[PDB]
Amino acid sequence: KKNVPHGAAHIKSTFNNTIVTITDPQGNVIAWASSGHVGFKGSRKSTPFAAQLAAENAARKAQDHGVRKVDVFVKGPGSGRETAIRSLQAAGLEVGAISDVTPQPHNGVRPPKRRRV
Amino acid sequence: AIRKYKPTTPGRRGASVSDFAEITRSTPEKSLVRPLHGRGGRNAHGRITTRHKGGGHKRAYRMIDFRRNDKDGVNAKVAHIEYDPNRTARIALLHYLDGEKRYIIAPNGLSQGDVVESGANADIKPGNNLPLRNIPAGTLIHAVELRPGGGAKLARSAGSSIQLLGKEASYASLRMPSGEIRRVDVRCRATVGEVGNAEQANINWGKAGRMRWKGKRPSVRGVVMNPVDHPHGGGEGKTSGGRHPVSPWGKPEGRTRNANKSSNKFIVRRRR
Amino acid sequence: CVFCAKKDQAIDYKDTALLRTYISERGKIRARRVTGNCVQHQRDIALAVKNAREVALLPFTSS
Amino acid sequence: ALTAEQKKEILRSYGLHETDTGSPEAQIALLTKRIADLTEHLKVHKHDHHSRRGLLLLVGRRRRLIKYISQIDVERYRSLIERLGLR
Amino acid sequence: MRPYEIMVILDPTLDERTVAPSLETFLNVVRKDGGKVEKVDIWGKRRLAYEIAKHAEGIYVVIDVKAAPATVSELDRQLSLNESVLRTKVMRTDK
RNA sequence: UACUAAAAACACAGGUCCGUGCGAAGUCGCAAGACGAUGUAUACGGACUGACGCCUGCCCGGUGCUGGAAGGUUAAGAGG
RNA sequence: ACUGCAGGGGAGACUGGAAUUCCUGGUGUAGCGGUGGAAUGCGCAGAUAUCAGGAGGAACACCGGUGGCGAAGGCGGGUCUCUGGGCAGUAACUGACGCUGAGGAGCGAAAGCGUGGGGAGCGAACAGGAUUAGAUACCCUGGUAGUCCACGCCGUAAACGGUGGGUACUAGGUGUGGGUUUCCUUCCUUGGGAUCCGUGCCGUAGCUAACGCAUUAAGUACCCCGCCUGGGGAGUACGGCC
Ligand SMILES: [Mg+2]
Ligand SMILES: [Mg+2]
Ligand SMILES: [Mg+2]
Ligand SMILES: [Mg+2]
Ligand SMILES: [Mg+2]
Ligand SMILES: [Mg+2]
Ligand SMILES: [Mg+2]
Ligand SMILES: [Mg+2]
Ligand SMILES: [Mg+2]
Ligand SMILES: [Mg+2]
Ligand SMILES: [Mg+2]
Ligand SMILES: [Mg+2]
Ligand SMILES: [Mg+2]
Ligand SMILES: [Mg+2]
Ligand SMILES: [Mg+2]
Ligand SMILES: [Mg+2]
Ligand SMILES: [Mg+2]
Ligand SMILES: [Mg+2]
Ligand SMILES: [Mg+2]
Ligand SMILES: [Mg+2]
Ligand SMILES: [Mg+2]
Ligand SMILES: [Mg+2]
Ligand SMILES: [Mg+2]
Ligand SMILES: [Mg+2]
Ligand SMILES: [Mg+2]
Ligand SMILES: [Mg+2]
Ligand SMILES: [Mg+2]
Ligand SMILES: [Mg+2]
Ligand SMILES: [Mg+2]
Ligand SMILES: [Mg+2]
Ligand SMILES: [Mg+2]
Ligand SMILES: [Mg+2]
Ligand SMILES: [Mg+2]
Ligand SMILES: [Mg+2]
Ligand SMILES: [Mg+2]
Ligand SMILES: [Mg+2]
Ligand SMILES: [Mg+2]
Ligand SMILES: [Mg+2]
Ligand SMILES: [Mg+2]
Ligand SMILES: [Mg+2]
Ligand SMILES: [Mg+2]
Ligand SMILES: [Mg+2]
Ligand SMILES: [Mg+2]
Ligand SMILES: [Mg+2]
Ligand SMILES: [Mg+2]
Ligand SMILES: [Mg+2]
Ligand SMILES: [Mg+2]
Ligand SMILES: [Zn+2]
């Protein structure tokens, strides 16, 4: 029962999931619908279809709560970034500027050991 | 720092002793010494209330100035560093420019002949005493007091220090030697620097006699008593105590701090 | 190397107007081969950029 | 270190004829000065092995020059020994 | 006796007109120690590339002290001790 | 172990764990007050082990201790 | 010796940003994480995600390279202090004072040991899940010492250029680094030419069983030290030193 005409959209697209949360410009989440939140489980949560449908769910929840336009911050080496962007665009929301906010450590924390599979 | 004895006797085999390299003037100041006598851990009723006390070497008390309130703006010169049998740190004798002598806890790096200031305008140097409002955050301080004018009470043992985390409105957050975060009023006074003699914890007393000199009497385990004496007593051979560990008066292990003490509102985070 | 060409040129970390060059739009120090400088002048430029970032005349991470 | 005038002072103190720099006497004097300075520095920074190696090299060079001057002129060797220091 | 150049960053809360008398004492300590001050040009209010101590603005001063290393170290320690100084950086003009 | 047991028993220096932020914890006392300590976590108290050397494996199901509060159950009071 | 030159050579002290984790509070609800697929695991007692603030340790993206330095091992966030070595130029000075070096001494990756501190992340051991006939592994979830600091110890690596140190000589071609030098000196070109010190590649003769080396030799000679006499047993036994 709020009204936030402008807000922010955060998409976290990783190799195992895709989280699409929509916040006000101060960063307070209004909706957070995810690939697991929509019907999906297992490794299918990282599929582009799952990411795009999660974007649809987030966009419709934002429309219900009263959001008309949001900027998009994306991060993670996921493949659902562009599909989520297109769904957010042509699902009744305007994206505006697209920015990448992926963290970049200046040689900080040591990564885990390489996979010997 | 620490001098190791040679294994000339079984009692000396592994022992060590301070070299006392920081000490000058091996005698105290006659006008700042008060008498002391032992108690053996007995209270006004004449009954043992603390066990394992007694014997011990004779001692005399040296008046330590734990307030440092009335000499603001008056400089002092460090005249001597002396041994003190009543604490683990060393003490420094101060000659004030007004003609008065005082004893303070010797901080780390306060060699003889230095100048010590006090008050809000004092510089941030080891030995300078200031109210917490004038000490910048992140400093290492010691001899802090709980109430304004109450006298230093925290971080007084050898090697102790307190980190001033920050001052919020009228309270200062302190990281205390145990690791507990606490808030005290910004008007409380503190001394800049760390307490000296930090290596005394590595001293290896070699024999029972040395602790008898230091005034510590033998301690008997509960599992070798009779059940009329201790809850752990009894058994045919040696046992582990027939129950969960308890005190000699039957109290189980666990927190003993009062659960609703008035000071709970001043403690930010309990120690690990 | 423009500094080798035009000799007697002061390279300073406070010279933010000159140091704006040799950095990308994201605050990335430009490559030596891209700038065309020699090794010594490239190292001096990098040191000046680092000092400027330390004294907050240039941003560490630009977004 | 051994700045210009610092070198010149020892050079005129231990030289042969008002301009000598490469004689065993002047070389040994300068090496002794460098060795003393390096050891005094090494009382601090006890883990400066890269400079302790240079100090050892200087010690070896001075020892070789001392041996040469001792073999070539016993009187000059004794004079330099009393003027600088041995054992 | 070496030539130094020190840049000091002050909090924006202080006004830009009384800045010189405040650091005159930090110059006079060097003066007594036996150093000479070349130029104390003040850049005034400027924007920082990022927030420092929750401040988006600061005051820039170039001190340019030519004094002994121990004296310069003492001056830097005093500047860091002072709570109105946000950043301090000392570099040698020569090698 | 005065008066049948002097020892492998107790203590011990060293070790670990637990408690204690300060008229602390603990103890004596109905309380005031006291010891702890004219000490302040490198300090004090409790428990076990017992110079030194090499080490100290698996189990948190039970019972304790520490922490949490979604749900069930539950006193006086309120209500009537 | 004097004048210049380049450098992650080294030690100490102070200090900066990114990122991870953790803590507190706000927004907020049913998933999060993980894989080839999953499950163990985390959340619903309010997690993942988002914002703001704080705490803490480790490592210093871009520069950054085929590059530089160092006897080797190794060496770059920044600033300051102290200090080592090398190269170039003049020939200013001494006058064979040189080379190698049995033993001996010092330095010496990582792992490990002792004492105190520290511990974000990773991570032997260990535990659970998964694969498989079995899985004491590869994969996943965790997680202790350790990795970090201070002072010591240990002296071992495919510690490799699988090539000991020094010197003299033996076509060239083409990159890079530090200098100097006249000329083409404005042909602006910071290019070409000459010399010194290196660092790569290709290539003449010569050598080699071949692969290959080839002015940075494994070519032509000299001086010094170290090492081998078939493969296992074995770099092990005994003795001795630490
Ligand atoms: Mg009585
Ligand atoms: Mg006791
Ligand atoms: Mg006992
Ligand atoms: Mg008995
Ligand atoms: Mg009895
Ligand atoms: Mg009983
Ligand atoms: Mg028994
Ligand atoms: Mg039995
Ligand atoms: Mg037991
Ligand atoms: Mg029992
Ligand atoms: Mg008897
Ligand atoms: Mg008998
Ligand atoms: Mg007997
Ligand atoms: Mg007995
Ligand atoms: Mg009590
Ligand atoms: Mg404890
Ligand atoms: Mg126990
Ligand atoms: Mg026993
Ligand atoms: Mg004990
Ligand atoms: Mg159990
Ligand atoms: Mg249990
Ligand atoms: Mg359990
Ligand atoms: Mg409970
Ligand atoms: Mg160090
Ligand atoms: Mg943590
Ligand atoms: Mg939250
Ligand atoms: Mg969060
Ligand atoms: Mg001659
Ligand atoms: Mg040799
Ligand atoms: Mg040898
Ligand atoms: Mg190691
Ligand atoms: Mg260790
Ligand atoms: Mg340890
Ligand atoms: Mg298992
Ligand atoms: Mg693993
Ligand atoms: Mg892990
Ligand atoms: Mg071990
Ligand atoms: Mg060694
Ligand atoms: Mg190597
Ligand atoms: Mg050979
Ligand atoms: Mg050779
Ligand atoms: Mg050769
Ligand atoms: Mg070449
Ligand atoms: Mg070739
Ligand atoms: Mg061959
Ligand atoms: Mg052997
Ligand atoms: Mg043997
Ligand atoms: Zn250049």
Helix (H) or strand (E) holding D4: helix D4-14
- Give the amino acid at B252: P
The set of residues, in sequence order, having a beta carbon less than 8 Å from that of E16 and lying 6+ positions away, is: E42, E44, E45, E59
Q: Which residues pair with B171 in a beta bridge?
A: B185
Distance (Å) from CA C42 to ligand 33 centroid: 45
Closest residue, CA to C1' of G10? D50
Q: Describe chain D by its helix, strand, coil percentages, rounded to 5.
A: 75, 0, 25
∠ CA(B42), CA(B45), CA(B46), 5° rounding?
45
Q: Which of A54, A89, A57, A60 is nearest to A72 (CA)?
A: A89
**Cα(B90)–Cα(B24) distance, integer angstroms:** 11
The set of residues, in sequence order, having a beta carbon less than 8 Å from that of A7 and lying 6+ positions away, is: A22, A23, A24, A25, A30, A62, A67, A69, A70, A71
Q: Which of B110, B45, B117, B53 is nearest to B80 (CA)?
A: B110
C-alpha separations of D33 from D2, D11, D58 in Å: 8, 11, 10
Q: Are A52 and A14 in contact (CB under 8 A)?
A: no
Biggest CA–CA distance in chain B, Å, is: 71
Helix (H/G/I), strand (E/B), else coil: B192: strand
Q: Which two tokens stand for residue E62?
A: 């170039």
**Cα(E61)–Cα(E41) distance, integer angstroms:** 6
Query: Please, which positions of strand F sit below 7 A from a protein CB?
Result: 9-14, 18-29, 33-36, 38-52, 63-67
**Cα(E45)–Cα(E58) distance, integer angstroms:** 6
**Cα(D6)–Cα(D4) distance, integer angstroms:** 5
- Using CB atoms within 10 A of its CB, is residue B189 exposed (0-12), middle (13-18) or buried (19+)? buried
Q: How far apart are the CA of A101 and the nearest CA of chain C, in angstroms?
A: 8
CB contact under 8 A, E87 and C56: yes
Tokens 């460098």 correspond to: D34
Distance (Å) from CA B18 to ligand 47 centroid: 42
The answer to whether the Cα torsion of C2, C3, C5, C9 is positive or negative is: positive
The answer to whether the Cα torsion of E37, E39, E45, E51 is positive or negative is: negative
Neighbours of E58 (CB within 10 A): 24
Q: Which of A17, A23, A76 is nearest to A51 (CA)?
A: A17
Q: Are E67 and E36 in contact (CB under 8 A)?
A: yes
The set of residues, in sequence order, having a beta carbon less than 8 Å from that of D49 and lying 6+ positions away, is: none
**Cα(B82)–Cα(B93) distance, integer angstroms:** 8
Helix (H/G/I), strand (E/B), else coil: B241: coil
C-alpha separations of A81 from A55, A60, B214 in Å: 10, 18, 73
Helix (H/G/I), strand (E/B), else coil: A44: helix
Q: Which of A96, B127, B121, B46 is nearest to E82 (CA)?
A: B121
Q: Are B111 and B76 in contact (CB under 8 A)?
A: no
Pairing mode of beta strands A98-100, A69-75: parallel
**Cα(E85)–Cα(A115) distance, integer angstroms:** 49
Give how far the C-alpha of residue B253 lies from the chain's centroid of Cα atoms, to the nearest Å: 25
Q: Which residues pair with A6 in a beta bridge?
A: A69
Q: Which residues pair with E88 in a beta bridge?
A: E8
Q: Closest nucleotide (CA of B37 to C1')?
A: F38
Q: Which two tokens stand for residue C16?
A: 């933010």
| Residues in chain C after which the chain is broken, C→N over 2.5 Å | none
Q: Please compute Rg for chain E using Cα positions.
A: 13
DSSP state of E21: H
Tokens 């976290």 correspond to: A12
DSSP state of A113: P
Q: Which of B82, B115, B114 is nearest to B197 (CA)?
A: B82
**Cα(A22)–Cα(A12) distance, integer angstroms:** 12
C-alpha separations of E90 from E31, E69, E71, E79 in Å: 18, 11, 13, 11
The structure was resolved experimentally with cryo-EM
**Cα(A80)–Cα(C46) distance, integer angstroms:** 38
- End-to-end, the C-alpha distance of chain E in Å comes to 13
Strand F contacts (CB < 7 A) among B residues 7-66? 13-15, 34, 36, 39, 41-45, 47-53, 61, 63-64, 66
HSE at residue B70, side-chain half, CA atoms within 13 A, is 5
The set of residues, in sequence order, having a beta carbon less than 8 Å from that of B202 and lying 6+ positions away, is: B2, B16
Angle between the D24-42 and D4-14 helix axes, to the nearest 10 degrees?
130
Q: Are E37 and E5 in contact (CB under 8 A)?
A: no
Q: Are B126 and B193 in contact (CB under 8 A)?
A: yes
b/e burial code for range B94-133 (CB count within 10 A of at least 16 → b): bbeeeeeebbbbbbbebeeeeebbbbeebebbbbbbbbbe
| Phi then psi dihedrals of residue A64, to 5 deg | -60, -45
**Cα(B267)–Cα(E14) distance, integer angstroms:** 35
Q: Closest nucleotide (CA of A37 to C1')?
A: G31
Q: Which of C33, C53, C51 is nearest to C42 (CA)?
A: C33
**What's the length of chain E?**
95
Pairing mode of beta strands E55-62, E42-52: antiparallel
**Cα(B107)–Cα(B144) distance, integer angstroms:** 13
For B145 and G117, how far is CA from C1' in angstroms? Answer: 27
Q: Which two tokens stand for residue B124?
A: 């941030």
**Cα(B37)–Cα(A5) distance, integer angstroms:** 80
Helix (H) or strand (E) holding D36: helix D24-42
∠ CA(B40), CA(B44), CA(B46), 5° rounding?
55
Q: Which residues of E touch C13 (CB under 8 A)?
A: 91
Q: Which residues pair with B101 in a beta bridge?
A: B95
Entry resolution in angstroms?
Answer: 2.6
Q: Which two tokens stand for residue B33?
A: 């010494």
